Amino acid sequence: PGASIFRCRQCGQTISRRDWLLPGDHEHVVFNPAGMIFRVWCFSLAQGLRLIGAPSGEFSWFKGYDWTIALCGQCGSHLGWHYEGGSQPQTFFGLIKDRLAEGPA
Ligand SMILES: O=C1CC[C@]2(CC(c3ccccc3Cl)=NO2)C(=O)N1
Ligand code: NA
Ligand SMILES: [Zn+2]
Domain boundaries, the chain: 3-105
Please tell me the experimental approach by which this structure was elucidated.
X-ray
In sequence order, which residues have a C-beta less than 8 Å from that of residue 64 and are 6 or more positions away?
Answer: 85, 86, 87
Signed CA dihedral, 51, 34, 8, 6: sign only: positive
Measuring from atom 13 of ligand 1, which residue has the nearest CA?
A: 33
In sequence order, which residues have a C-beta less than 8 Å from that of residue 34 and are 6 or more positions away?
Answer: none
* 72 annotated to a ligand binding site: yes
In 3D space, the residue among 48, 88, 52, 44 whose CA is nearest the CA of residue 70 turns out to be 52
**Cis bond before residue 23 (omega within 30° of 0):** no
Say if ligand 1 is within 6 A of residue 59 CB.
Answer: yes
State whether CATH 2.30.40.10 applies to domain 3-105: no
Say if ligand 1 is within 6 A of residue 61 CB.
Answer: yes
Cα–Cα distance measured from residue 61 to residue 19, given in angstroms and rounded to the nearest whole number:
23
* Ligand 1 atom index nearest CA of 32: 18
Resolution of the structure in the document, Å: 1.8
